[PDB]
Short mmCIF file of C-alpha atoms in Angstrom, two decimals:
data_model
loop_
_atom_site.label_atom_id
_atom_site.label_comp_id
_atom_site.label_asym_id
_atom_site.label_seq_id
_atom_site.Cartn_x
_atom_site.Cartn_y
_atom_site.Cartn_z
CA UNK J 1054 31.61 0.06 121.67
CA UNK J 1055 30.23 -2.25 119.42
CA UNK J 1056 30.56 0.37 116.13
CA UNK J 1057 34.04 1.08 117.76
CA UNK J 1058 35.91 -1.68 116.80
CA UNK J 1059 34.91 -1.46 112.84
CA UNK J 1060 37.16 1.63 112.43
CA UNK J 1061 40.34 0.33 114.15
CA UNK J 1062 42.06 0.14 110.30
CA UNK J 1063 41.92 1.16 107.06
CA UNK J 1064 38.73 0.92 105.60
CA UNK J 1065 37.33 1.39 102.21
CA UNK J 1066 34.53 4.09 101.14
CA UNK J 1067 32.21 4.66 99.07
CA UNK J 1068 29.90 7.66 97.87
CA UNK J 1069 27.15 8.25 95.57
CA UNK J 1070 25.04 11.05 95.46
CA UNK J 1071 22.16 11.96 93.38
CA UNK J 1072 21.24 15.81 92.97
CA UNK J 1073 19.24 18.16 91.28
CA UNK J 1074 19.93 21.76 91.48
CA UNK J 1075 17.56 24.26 89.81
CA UNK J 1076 16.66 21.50 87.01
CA UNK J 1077 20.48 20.88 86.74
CA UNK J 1078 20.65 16.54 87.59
CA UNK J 1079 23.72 15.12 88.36
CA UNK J 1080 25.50 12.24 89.59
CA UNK J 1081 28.79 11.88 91.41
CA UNK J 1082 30.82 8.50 92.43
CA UNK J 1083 33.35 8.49 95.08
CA UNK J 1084 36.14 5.79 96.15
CA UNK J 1085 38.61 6.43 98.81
CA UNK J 1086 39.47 5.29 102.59
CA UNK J 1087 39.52 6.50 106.23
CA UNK J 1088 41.39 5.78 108.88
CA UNK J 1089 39.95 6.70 112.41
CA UNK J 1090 42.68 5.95 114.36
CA UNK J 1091 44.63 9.17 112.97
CA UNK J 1092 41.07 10.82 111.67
CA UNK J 1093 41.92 10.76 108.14
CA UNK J 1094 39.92 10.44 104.70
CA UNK J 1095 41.29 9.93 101.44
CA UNK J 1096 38.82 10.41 98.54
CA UNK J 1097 38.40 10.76 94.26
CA UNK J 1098 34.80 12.24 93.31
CA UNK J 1099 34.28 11.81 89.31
CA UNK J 1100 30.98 13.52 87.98
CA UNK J 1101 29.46 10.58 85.83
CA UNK J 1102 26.90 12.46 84.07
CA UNK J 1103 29.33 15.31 82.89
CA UNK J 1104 30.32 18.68 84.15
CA UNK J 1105 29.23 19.30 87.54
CA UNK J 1106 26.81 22.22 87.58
CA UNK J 1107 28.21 23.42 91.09
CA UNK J 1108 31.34 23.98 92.63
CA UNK J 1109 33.43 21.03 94.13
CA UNK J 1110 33.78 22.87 97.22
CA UNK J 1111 29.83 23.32 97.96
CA UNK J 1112 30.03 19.11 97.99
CA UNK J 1113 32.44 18.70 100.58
CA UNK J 1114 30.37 18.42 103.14
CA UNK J 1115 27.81 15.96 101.69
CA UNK J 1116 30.28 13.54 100.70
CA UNK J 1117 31.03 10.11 106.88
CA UNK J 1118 32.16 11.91 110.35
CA UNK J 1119 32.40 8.33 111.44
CA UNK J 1120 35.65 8.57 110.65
CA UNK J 1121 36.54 11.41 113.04
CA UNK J 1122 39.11 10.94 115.81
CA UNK J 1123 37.55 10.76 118.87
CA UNK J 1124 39.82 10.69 121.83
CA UNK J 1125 40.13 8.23 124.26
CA UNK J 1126 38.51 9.85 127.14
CA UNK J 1127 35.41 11.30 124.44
CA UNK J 1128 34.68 7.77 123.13
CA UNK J 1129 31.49 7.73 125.14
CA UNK J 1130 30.10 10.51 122.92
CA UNK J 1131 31.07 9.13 119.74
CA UNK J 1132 27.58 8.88 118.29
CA UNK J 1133 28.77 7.94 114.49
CA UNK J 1134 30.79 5.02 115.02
CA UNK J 1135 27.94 3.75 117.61
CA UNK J 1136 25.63 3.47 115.21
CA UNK J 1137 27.65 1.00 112.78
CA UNK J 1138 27.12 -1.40 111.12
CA UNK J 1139 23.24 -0.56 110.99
CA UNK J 1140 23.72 3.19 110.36
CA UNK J 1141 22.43 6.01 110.21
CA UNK J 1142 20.68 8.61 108.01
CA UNK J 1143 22.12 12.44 108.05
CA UNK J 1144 20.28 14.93 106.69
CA UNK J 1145 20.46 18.53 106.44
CA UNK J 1146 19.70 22.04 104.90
CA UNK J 1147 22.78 24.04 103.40
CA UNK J 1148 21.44 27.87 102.84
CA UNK J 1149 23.94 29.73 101.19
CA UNK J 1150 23.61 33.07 102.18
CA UNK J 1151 21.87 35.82 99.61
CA UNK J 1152 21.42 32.59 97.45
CA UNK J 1153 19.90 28.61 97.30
CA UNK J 1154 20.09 26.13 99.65
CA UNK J 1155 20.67 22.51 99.24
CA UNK J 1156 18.57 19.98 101.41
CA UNK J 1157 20.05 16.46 102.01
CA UNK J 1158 19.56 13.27 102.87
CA UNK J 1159 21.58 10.65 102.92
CA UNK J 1160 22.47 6.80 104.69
CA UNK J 1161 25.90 5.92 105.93
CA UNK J 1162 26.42 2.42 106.29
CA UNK J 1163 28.14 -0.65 106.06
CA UNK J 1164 28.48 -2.66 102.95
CA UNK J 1165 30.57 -5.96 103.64
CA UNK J 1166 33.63 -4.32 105.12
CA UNK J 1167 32.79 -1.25 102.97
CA UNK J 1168 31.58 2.10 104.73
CA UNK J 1169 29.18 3.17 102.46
CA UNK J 1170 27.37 6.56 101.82
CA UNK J 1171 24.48 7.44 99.53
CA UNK J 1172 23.04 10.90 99.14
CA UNK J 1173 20.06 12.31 97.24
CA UNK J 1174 20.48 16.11 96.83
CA UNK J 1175 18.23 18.87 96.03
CA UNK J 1176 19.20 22.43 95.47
CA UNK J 1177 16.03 25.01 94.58
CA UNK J 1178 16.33 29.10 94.45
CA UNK J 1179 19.86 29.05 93.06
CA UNK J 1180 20.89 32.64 91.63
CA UNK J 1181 22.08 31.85 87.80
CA UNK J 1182 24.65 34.31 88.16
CA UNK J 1183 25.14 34.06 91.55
CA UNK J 1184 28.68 32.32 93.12
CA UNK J 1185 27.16 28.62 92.77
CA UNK J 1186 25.85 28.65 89.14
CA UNK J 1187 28.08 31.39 88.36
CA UNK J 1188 30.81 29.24 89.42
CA UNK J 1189 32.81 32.05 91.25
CA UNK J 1190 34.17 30.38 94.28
CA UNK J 1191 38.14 29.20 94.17
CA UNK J 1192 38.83 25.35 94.51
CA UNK J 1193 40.07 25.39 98.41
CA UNK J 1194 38.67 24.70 101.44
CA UNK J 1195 39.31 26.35 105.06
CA UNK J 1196 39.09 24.90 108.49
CA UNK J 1197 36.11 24.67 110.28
CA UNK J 1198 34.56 23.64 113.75
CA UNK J 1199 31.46 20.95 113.73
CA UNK J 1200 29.19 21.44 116.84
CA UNK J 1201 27.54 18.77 118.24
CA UNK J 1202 24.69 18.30 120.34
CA UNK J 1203 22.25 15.07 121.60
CA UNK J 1204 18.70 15.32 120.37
CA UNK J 1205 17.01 12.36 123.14
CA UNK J 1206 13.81 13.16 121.13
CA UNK J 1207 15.06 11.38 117.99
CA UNK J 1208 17.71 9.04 120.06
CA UNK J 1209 20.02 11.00 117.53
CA UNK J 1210 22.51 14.18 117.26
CA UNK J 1211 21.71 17.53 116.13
CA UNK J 1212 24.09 19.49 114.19
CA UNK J 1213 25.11 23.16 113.17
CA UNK J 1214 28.17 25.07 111.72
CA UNK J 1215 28.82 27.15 109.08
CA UNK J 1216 31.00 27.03 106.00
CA UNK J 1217 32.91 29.46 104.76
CA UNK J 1218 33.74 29.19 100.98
CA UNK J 1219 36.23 31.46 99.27
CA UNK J 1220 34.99 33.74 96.63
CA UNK J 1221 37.18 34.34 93.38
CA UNK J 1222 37.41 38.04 94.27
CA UNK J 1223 38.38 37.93 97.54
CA UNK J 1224 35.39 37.77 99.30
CA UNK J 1225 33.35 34.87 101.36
CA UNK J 1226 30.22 32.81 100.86
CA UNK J 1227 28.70 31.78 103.95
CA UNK J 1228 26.69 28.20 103.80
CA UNK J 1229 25.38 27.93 107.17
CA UNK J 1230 24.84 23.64 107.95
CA UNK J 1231 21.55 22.48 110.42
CA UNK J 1232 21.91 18.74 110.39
CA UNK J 1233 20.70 15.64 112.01
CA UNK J 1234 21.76 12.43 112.33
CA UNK J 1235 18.98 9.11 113.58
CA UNK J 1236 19.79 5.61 113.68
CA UNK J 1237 18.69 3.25 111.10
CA UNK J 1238 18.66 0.18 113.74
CA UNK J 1239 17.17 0.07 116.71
CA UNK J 1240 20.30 -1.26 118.49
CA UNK J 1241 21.54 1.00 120.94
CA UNK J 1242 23.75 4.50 120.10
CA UNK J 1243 26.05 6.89 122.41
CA UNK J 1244 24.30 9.88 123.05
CA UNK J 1245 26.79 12.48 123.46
CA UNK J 1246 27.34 15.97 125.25
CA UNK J 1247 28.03 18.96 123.33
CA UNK J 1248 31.49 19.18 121.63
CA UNK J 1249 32.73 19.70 118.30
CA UNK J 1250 34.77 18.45 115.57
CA UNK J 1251 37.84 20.32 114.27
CA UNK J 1252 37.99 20.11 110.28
CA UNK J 1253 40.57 20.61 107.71
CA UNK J 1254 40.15 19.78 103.90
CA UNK J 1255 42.76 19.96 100.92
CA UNK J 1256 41.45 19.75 97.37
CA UNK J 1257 43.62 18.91 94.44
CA UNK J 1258 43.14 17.54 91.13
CA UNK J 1259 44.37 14.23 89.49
CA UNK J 1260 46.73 14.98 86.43
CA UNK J 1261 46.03 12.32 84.25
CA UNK J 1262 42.07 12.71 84.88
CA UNK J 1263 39.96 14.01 82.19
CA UNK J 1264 36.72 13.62 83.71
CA UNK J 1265 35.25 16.40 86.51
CA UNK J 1266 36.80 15.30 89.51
CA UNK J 1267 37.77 16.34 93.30
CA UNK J 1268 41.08 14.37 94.57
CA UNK J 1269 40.00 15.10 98.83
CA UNK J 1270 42.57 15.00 101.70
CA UNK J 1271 40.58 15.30 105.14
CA UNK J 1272 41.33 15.20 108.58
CA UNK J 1273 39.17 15.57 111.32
CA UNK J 1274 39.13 15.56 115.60
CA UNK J 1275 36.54 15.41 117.96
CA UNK J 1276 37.32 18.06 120.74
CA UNK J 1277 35.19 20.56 123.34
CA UNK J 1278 35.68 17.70 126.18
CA UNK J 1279 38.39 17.22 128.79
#
């Protein structure tokens, strides 16, 4: 497809994302690069404005499935790389369960060769001592499954999963994900059948960085289709 053939390399990213949670503002810059062909994402967040008032982990998600494998014989239903270079916005509602939720919205598109995405964020009826303000949850990530679905209505993709963040005593903290995904041209997109994306994330730290930061080592595959 036309989209297709931007993501045959390496190709640089970039995030920013603008949030407020409870009153807490924030503002987080990221630099990295994906490579479709093996579905991989390399990334460095850096809170700008200071200590990030949530947990890394709750982030991941916000911060370009674009970059997702999709096999040969599922390229018809790979909506995110059809899109490009126009874009598209993605938006969504994180509710962490027996807590706040987060509501999103964000554009992912091209810069020059870049593969940009910006993100305004806004978090309401945290908990101040609950695992997100309390900072309780460990700095991991599991593996998760994306499902996908076409929504003709919107010419788009709807969106649901749920996220599964590790608690520092043991325990789990669901964030269940509705998103969708529209177009920003009007050029046409791939409308796809259901199928889902298989997810794994590894979170480190840079030694020699001071600031807050999230070093992010992703790899993603679109699967559910034979």
């Amino acid at each position: 497809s036309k989209g297709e053939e931007l993501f045959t390399g390496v190709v640089p990213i970039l995030v920013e994302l603008d949030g407020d949670v409870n009153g807490h503002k924030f503002s987080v810059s990221g630099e990295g690069e994906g490579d479709a062909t093996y579905g991989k994402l390399t990334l460095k967040f850096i809170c700008t404005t200071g200590k990030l008032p949530v947990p890394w982990p709750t982030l991941v998600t916000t911060f370009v499935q674009c970059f997702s494998r999709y096999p040969d014989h599922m390229k018809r239903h790979d909506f995110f790389k059809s899109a490009m270079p126009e874009g598209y916005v993605q938006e969504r509602t994180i509710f962490f369960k027996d807590d706040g939720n987060y509501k999103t919205r964000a554009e992912v598109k091209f810069e020059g060769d870049t593969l940009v995405n910006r993100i305004e964020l806004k978090g309401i009826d945290f908990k101040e001592d609950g695992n997100i303000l309390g900072h309780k949850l460990e700095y991991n990530y599991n593996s998760h499954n994306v499902y996908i679905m076409a929504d003709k209505q919107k010419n788009g993709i709807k969106v649901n999963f749920k996220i599964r963040h590790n608690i520092e005593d043991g325990s789990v903290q669901l964030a269940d994900h509705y998103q969708q995904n529209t177009p920003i041209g009007d050029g046409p997109v791939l409308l796809p059948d259901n199928h889902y994306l298989s997810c794994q994330s590894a979170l480190s730290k840079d030694p020699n960085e001071k600031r807050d930061h999230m070093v992010l080592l992703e790899f993603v595959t679109a699967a559910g289709i034979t």
